[PDB]
Amino acid sequence: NVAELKKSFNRHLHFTLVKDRNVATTRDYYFALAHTVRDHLVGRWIRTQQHYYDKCPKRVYYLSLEFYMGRTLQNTMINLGLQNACDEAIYQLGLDIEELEEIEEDAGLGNGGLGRLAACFLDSMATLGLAAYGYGIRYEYGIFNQKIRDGWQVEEADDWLRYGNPWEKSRPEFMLPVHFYGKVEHTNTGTKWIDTQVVLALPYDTPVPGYMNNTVNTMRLWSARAPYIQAVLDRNLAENISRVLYPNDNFFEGKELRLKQEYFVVAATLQDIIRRFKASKFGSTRGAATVFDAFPDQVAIQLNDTHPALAIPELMRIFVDIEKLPWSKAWELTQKTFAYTNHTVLPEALERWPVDLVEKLLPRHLEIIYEINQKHLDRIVALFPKDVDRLRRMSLIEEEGSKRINMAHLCIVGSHAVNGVAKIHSDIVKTKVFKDFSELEPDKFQNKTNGITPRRWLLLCNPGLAELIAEKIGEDYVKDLSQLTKLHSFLGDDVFLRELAKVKQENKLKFSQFLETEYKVKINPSSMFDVQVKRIHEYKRQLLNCLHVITMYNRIKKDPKKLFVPRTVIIGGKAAPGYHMAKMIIKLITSVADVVNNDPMVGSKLKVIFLENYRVSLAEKVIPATDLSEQISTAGTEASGTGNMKFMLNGALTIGTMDGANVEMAEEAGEENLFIFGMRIDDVAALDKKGYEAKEYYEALPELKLVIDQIDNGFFSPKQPDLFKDIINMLFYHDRFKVFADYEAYVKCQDKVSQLYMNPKAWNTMVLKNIAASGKFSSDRTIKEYAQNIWNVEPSDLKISLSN
Amino acid sequence: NVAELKKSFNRHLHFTLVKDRNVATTRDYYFALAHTVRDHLVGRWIRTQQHYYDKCPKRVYYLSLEFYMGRTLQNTMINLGLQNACDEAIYQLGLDIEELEEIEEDAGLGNGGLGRLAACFLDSMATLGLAAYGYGIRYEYGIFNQKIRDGWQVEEADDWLRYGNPWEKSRPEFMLPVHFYGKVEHTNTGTKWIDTQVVLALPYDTPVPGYMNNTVNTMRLWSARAPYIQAVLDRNLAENISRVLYPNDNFFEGKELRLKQEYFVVAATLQDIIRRFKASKFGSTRGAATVFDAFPDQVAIQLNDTHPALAIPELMRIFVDIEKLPWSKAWELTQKTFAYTNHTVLPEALERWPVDLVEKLLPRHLEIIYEINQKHLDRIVALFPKDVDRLRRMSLIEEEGSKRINMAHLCIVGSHAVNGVAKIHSDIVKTKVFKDFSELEPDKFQNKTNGITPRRWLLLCNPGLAELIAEKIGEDYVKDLSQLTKLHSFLGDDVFLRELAKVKQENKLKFSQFLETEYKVKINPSSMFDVQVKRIHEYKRQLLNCLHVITMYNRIKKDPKKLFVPRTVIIGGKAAPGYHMAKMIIKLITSVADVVNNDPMVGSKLKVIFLENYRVSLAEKVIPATDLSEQISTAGTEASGTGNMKFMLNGALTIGTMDGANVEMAEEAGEENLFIFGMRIDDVAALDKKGYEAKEYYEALPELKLVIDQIDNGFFSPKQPDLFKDIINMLFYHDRFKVFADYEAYVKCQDKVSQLYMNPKAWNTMVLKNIAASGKFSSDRTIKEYAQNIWNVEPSDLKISLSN
């Protein structure tokens, strides 16, 4: 209760932080609170893991190079049902829990959607009571902190562990060795991988609390550690493996250090998984072969993209070289164990490691990969005697010039299930990208539409909305989001609609406070919050948005008195350090913003803000305060998107193309309840066939012309007129994302948005239909499908009893 | 009470280690116990520091690059008076208290005597209730762990922080920036140190519990931290500053990284000291010049050797460049603040940094050093118009060829007190080494004979002896070691003498168990334990000991039946990685040992063991089991020695030269109660004048000849006959430590030792006189002198009611 919590807080402030109320810092208070809450996880964490051992349910291992977790404090309190009591305790202690919460560093061990999906999945799996484990890397530095200097992005090291992470638990007794380089000998006692350099893998466990169910799963993250002065200093080399997260989103960078990270997670993970298996005492541990026949019935490993592809040849290595199992058997058990999820579209995102590199670092794995390919191709040849080109198409090796390994191909042949993350995407993957494989193995390919956890992305980030909905339809929706359809009953309820708007109103107010204390700008709280937050990339097209912003600005100047719905345009996101065009687009946006925000004639009519350091904790703030969600990727480029789901769940209307999950959002809530626009996948194809001539649009649309000329002649960069020539050049001759092609339809759609915004009742009526139809987008629904059609496991509804 | 301790232990095992009795590891139990004990320090640590703030007593800052702390668990329990109660709790919990304690890593942030003295001082100052602070570096890696492979020393990284250090407390809010490189600007506003690279200094506090007095002082250790991928990885460079402890004992290695460590500690320390001064509510602090007038009355900084010499020019820099104080005033306050302790007269040990290096790394400090020197020399010139050479002799700069800074000279002119660590040593420092300075400033030089804490080095390491003594004379001796003189009353008490021998007997038994489980050898528990443990160095002469060992071996072979007192010769210690001769001497010893231990004719008559990885925790084991302590440094080379004091306190007889504190040990217990031998300081001088011709001894002493020929011809290295030619060459033509010169007298003394050993009553009667006269060697006595004659502080003796 409140009294015991205050007592605990004081106890930790004293014994754990070694402070008293007159000397304690804000960070000390945060730590005291964190520990007070953390103590409540222990009992259930221990019992949960003990339960999995006793009952031996099939376990799920989500293997990923990224886990975009954000902060843990508030999420733990909520899932533990502790928030209001801690709220009261901290208040009575004379402190502000909200300020204590801001002390916590984000666990930004991810780039964006891919990493955040893993995070949402862990929460859902814990809530569904599944015996699930998250396996990743404990990066000393996560996604860099972003600063904006003189309009340009500036990176700063994310030293998130500097003062200690109370949410992680070092597990010394489970340390393991990982091998690199060396050579291989095929002796008469099996093949041996020798002369290798060893790097220790130290696991750190972080509790994953299920929502109100006594289940507490585990996220195990590995850190690299080394097994006269210069020699000691050189231990840094081994430790560099888990030093930093590669800041690339949808872009493959074949650096050797990255390959080392991939094998690192994979090696430690699989060895730890096998150790756990061989300790489970599973039905008859009979020596030597020790069964392992039940391994696939007790273990499921999901490959989050191809980053951990090496897991396949690594399991084979363990089964064959160490466990001495016959190849055919090992391969069988291997396919039954692995499942691969594809999240990529762009050619530049595909992982293709040159063989030479892999030969040097992982000689034994290259051999195993060649053997897998050999057996793979033999069969195709067996099935298609007269189709030579089919062989080069399906091989795991691309021989043309420099030889490379197609990691996706390896994942496909080593897994019993391959899934995309959205209907439109899964179809492209199955019928186009991997047509040669799906024809041969139809039933292998599936779709699993992404989802987001309604705990973090609703109960946590928008308590006001969560409360309002609960009051009307009960709390059942938290565990069964489809229940939101009940909200349809209030479609004509004016009072409800009024209450809905107030909540949004309240969120916008709180966020506007944030905006003003952070940026010199003054926000019109009456303005429509137009938001586009996500990683900066050309396919995302924040550039298209920028064109519309300039378009709006030019309209205001031309007619300073016309009827206009005021807007606050917010665009945020990080650009990969080496992504030149992305960095230029940021400076463009900041440039435009400086002109827009300071032009006296526009004044409070329109404000532009480049939201700095967009990350999970910040997302939890801006999303709830949004009116219009920008999801404008070129049709066919956004595999799924998840930010789109968060905005929909939080009371915002969507403006976007028929791409990724946007299509299913339209399916669920009705197309007229979303502002869809632009080319669709078939249109983009026709354009590519006919040939994209950007100038065409430029010379045919005056509003666009003025925008482009202004950018190109220096209207937004007077002291440096040709700053954006790179953007111009790409926009006119190398824009593979057809920005000008969707401009007109985009601007026309935008005007429609404004019209609806003038009608509060109609706007909120559409909002309600969106929220009421967002149920399918709960990651709980996603995981159920995975569990049922891929992992072959079963959700459990129980509860770790405590007192008596 | 025992019940609450068990309750607390279980609480921590659960909430802190996240384990239960069936899954907990030994490490986990150690941590649970460590936390249970640690909680007992909190109340008093907070109140002690609060008290210093409220009463504002003058503070003492012991600035050192080393603190050889050893383990903390047992020492804390003993000083807090909790050992029996905890011992009981662990027992009732079915746990082996011993096994838990062995889990703890030594905090080996020191090389040997210098670092251990700092550690003993912290304990004494806390016990004397002084407002003292230890300031050093938190090395990620301390003195390397030593292994012996194929008879040779092998180094392994001391990764002591790998699983966490419960005894340290990160103090985030006190982080500070340290500057390097850059350049000096001579502006209209004084000199500015611009364009520097910054390294953050993160302080970590470790509690220092006084013995049974409620006082808990602080040891604050600093760690370096950095303020695309390659850039992130390169943060390792800044962090390398506090990465490893330079493993040199009495040897100067002028590496740039070492210079960086020295400035690092100094910069962070002084800035933190000034910050604290400013916040101490003191007689109104105007501004600009926060007066600092009272700084010297509130602050005392002891320079542990010249390693932190930069502290002098750093304080001046702060006073002048930042606090804007006039030079004359700053210099005055500076001298009143600093005191310098000289810990060695060995030439190769003297710190002399080349100016070029200092100019590059610390340009502003080089300027300040030149100015100090200029004002220094001007005066000498003023006082000695006609003594030019006196100027080159007293200058802080040695211009001859490559220019260097004499750091000891800098420390002398910047301090109001300079002390040696033993009468014989302090005299050499004052009348010879720094004659030019002492004549000018007589009263500046002092002596402060070293000491060791009777807690760690008696109550902790030898509970049996401590108990026996307590039973006879009470427990008062712990806080007043001079009380041991009371033991003189039992000089003729046979029963007591018998009890004394039993205790030694028990220690030798326990240690013999250790020796056998670690080394294949079989120990004759009836043998005299002849021990020489300390860092390997030529001036220490473990080589001379080795010659005697070979001498004894050759006697056994020649007359396998003669009456002989059996001996177990133990020699241990680490050699600096780059000290070639030291490493050869180790291989020699291990070589000789292999021959001796396996020669059938000698059998149990004599056994030789090279004690591996000699360190504080191991010292606590071997010392209590010793019968004969080897302290045989060449007269005039061991400034003081402290190991000698530990052996004396623990029931062992000393064999040694009149060097360091050996002389005062002889003074205290009577020269006939110590086996003194060899050349004295005046003799070594005569020999140096006449010229040392080693061959002389070789051709005149047959026993030595056989020994040398055997070493030189390969008797101890058959498969490699000329392995020791380096030792031979140094022994005949470059032995500046006169090994052959003391050989005869040494061997003759050794025989005397054996004779006495045959008379148990006479031997233990001498032992009692030694123990009864070791009181002056308590570090409590040492600190009192420092406090009274240098720091001008007062040991406040009492106890503050806990929370009753």
Ligand SMILES: O=C(NCC(O)N(CCO)C1CCCC1)c1cc2cc(Cl)ccc2[nH]1
């Ligand atoms: O880190 C924890 N305890 C401290 C610890 O384990 N430890 C030893 C690590 O090996 C410390 C004692 C000395 C310094 C490091 C820790 C406890 C805990 C409990 C939950 Cl529910 C979740 C995460 C957790 N981490």
Ligand SMILES: O=C(NCC(O)N(CCO)C1CCCC1)c1cc2cc(Cl)ccc2[nH]1
């Ligand atoms: O380290 C301690 N507490 C933990 C802590 O301070 N902390 C924040 C460090 O900035 C942890 C919480 C999250 C992980 C690290 C600590 C407490 C303590 C008490 C005494 Cl008497 C002596 C040493 C000590 N160290």
Ligand SMILES: CC(=O)N[C@@H]1O[C@H](CO)[C@@H](O)[C@H](O)[C@H]1O
């Ligand atoms: C490689 C990569 O980052 N892919 C991203 O993955 C997430 C999660 O599946 C998708 O929603 C998103 O559209 C896609 O761009």
Ligand SMILES: CC(=O)N[C@@H]1O[C@H](CO)[C@@H](O)[C@H](O)[C@H]1O
């Ligand atoms: C430079 C150095 O490490 N000096 C050492 O200091 C200790 C502590 O004063 C002395 O006992 C010892 O004789 C001396 O060799």
